[PDB]
Amino acid sequence: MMELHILEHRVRVLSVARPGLWLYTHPLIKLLFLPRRSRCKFFSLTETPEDYTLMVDEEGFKELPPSEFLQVAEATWLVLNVSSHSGAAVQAAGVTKIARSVIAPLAEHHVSVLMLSTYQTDFILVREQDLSVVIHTLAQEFDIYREVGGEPVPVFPRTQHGPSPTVHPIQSPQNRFCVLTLDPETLPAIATTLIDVLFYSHEPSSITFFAFSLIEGYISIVMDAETQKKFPSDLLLTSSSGELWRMVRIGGQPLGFDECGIVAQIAGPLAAADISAYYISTFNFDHALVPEDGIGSVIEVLQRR
Amino acid sequence: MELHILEHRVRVLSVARPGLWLYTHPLIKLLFLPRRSRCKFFSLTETPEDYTLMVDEEGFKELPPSEFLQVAEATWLVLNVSSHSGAAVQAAGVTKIARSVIAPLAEHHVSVLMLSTYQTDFILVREQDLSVVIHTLAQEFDIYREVGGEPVPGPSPTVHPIQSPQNRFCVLTLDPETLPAIATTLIDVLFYSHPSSITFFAFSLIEGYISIVMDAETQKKFPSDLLLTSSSGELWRMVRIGGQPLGFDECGIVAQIAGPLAAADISAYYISTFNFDHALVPEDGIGSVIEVLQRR
Ligand SMILES: NC(=[NH2+])NCCC[C@H](N)C(=O)O
Ligand SMILES: NC(=[NH2+])NCCC[C@H](N)C(=O)O
């Protein structure tokens, strides 16, 4: 009934250490602001305290020179997206809704995922080495398509052994986050501010977290409510005003890319509690965004897991 | 009749094009984020050969050394002529000080660099020469040194070829509060865009005043009704001066360009870059200009 789409993106996952970010100002600004200057169709940049995580298609990857500040995940990642029958886009912040149908099945079959929720939709990245299993695992409950050119197309055999799944500690900083979009034609108007925030910036427990993605021409931004005050008024867009979000940071040790079942151990319980959630993986840690009014509940759900 | 020594200590550098990317982070700051640096004198000129930078010491601190960055040896001071009570003189007035400033400094072996902007004409001199400068200019000018914002009271000369590309140039200013609105475009032009025409683009932010020199074709790329220009109609043609890099020691080059133009009563902006000199003259007069300058 429901459809699962394999998008036409081959994605690399990278981490830029803060002290070296300046070195990559020239390519990044290009990828951020000059769509006529590159062939990139998948760009995601997330600032955390640890680093800047990049998820970029191969075309954008060509723009980033190697250095001691740039760590590159070894695998190439494919991008999955759930939609409804006939191809209608499903509501955003729906990571918990696919907890039983996508996340848990993939975890059970030892498929490691990376999550990238955006304003528009929820992307699930899987290593190309696992594609067959993915299909095998999800063909029962989804009609699977491959996006060839611009239109859909109906659809090594050893899943590697990962480390033993464990329970990971969680933290909840006090920041109030917003999920916003933007008319691309207005991106220049915020450019300088965005640049200032990404490249030249930097007790209540708070975290530095700022996500900007440009994917198939769609812009998505996750930012602190205070950071939004820095931006020109009446440009940042959201269809549900007053909706602010609290973050649950998942991980004590860096999580790597081999352990499975982390997203599942967060989204399962939240799904059972009927709580909506965005979910964004960075190079080292996971991040869930839940409605602020429910944060307490969420914590209690996650501490008895 | 006043000569002001401004409170700027300036370094003159050249970034080779293949290395420009390395300096995107500092330059953007200096271009667009005034709250993030103490720099008060910033000039960036793109030429076919390089990007010439003139930056005060604070801005100089932001620029890491590399194989693409040439640095002129001396520290330069900034001179500016003004009227009876500090009132500013007309812009494009390099020729109007040909007799009173440029020629005397050349005669006393003081090497200069010129930086004309939309607002005024700056004359840079190596600090080691300051005394001579005073000794030369005290007779005709009341000399004031700017302190805390208040005015407190070589090689053998050589012939240089001249060339006039066909670009029509505009000298423009901008309200700083509108600088964000053009940022991306400006960035695209400076950092991501790279014959009887030349590649020449000047941007300066000096004491909060913005000045831009660009060809009309480049002006079409910018959002309309933001770039400001007082007198319009007749744009400017460039005369490029030099057949090989001119260095910083030879004197009398500016004098041999601005002197004759002064005698012909022709106005001119004048911009020195790391390697060559550039005069901007009214376009409809280019023929006359070339005739005046080749009387030699
Ligand atoms: N670097 C990371 N964020 N790793 C954790 C991502 C989620 C984990 N691979 C899972 O399948 O549940
Ligand atoms: N790099 C240069 N632009 N050099 C020439 C500057 C003018 C010359 N020093 C003069 O005093 O007349």
UniProtKB/Swiss-Prot annotation, chain A:
Domain spans labelled ACT: 73-139, 242-303
Tissue specificity comment: Widely expressed.
Effect caused by changing residue 15 to A: Abolished phosphorylation by AKT1, leading to decreased interaction with RNF167 and subsequent ubiquitination
Effect noted on mutating residue 97 to R: In 3KR mutant; abolished ubiquitination by RNF167
A GO cellular component annotation in the UniProt record: cytosol
Phosphoserine found at: 15
Phosphoprotein listed as a keyword: yes
Consequence of substituting residue 258 to A: Decreased arginine-binding. Constitutively interacts with the GATOR2 complex
Result after altering residue 284 to K: No effect on interaction with the GATOR2 complex
Family: Belongs to the GATS family.
Subunit structure: Forms homodimers and heterodimers with CASTOR2. Interacts with the GATOR2 complex which is composed of MIOS, SEC13, SEH1L, WDR24 and WDR59; the interaction is negatively regulated by arginine. Interacts with TM4SF5; the interaction is positively regulated by leucine and is negatively regulated by arginine.
Name recorded for this polypeptide: Cytosolic arginine sensor for mTORC1 subunit 1
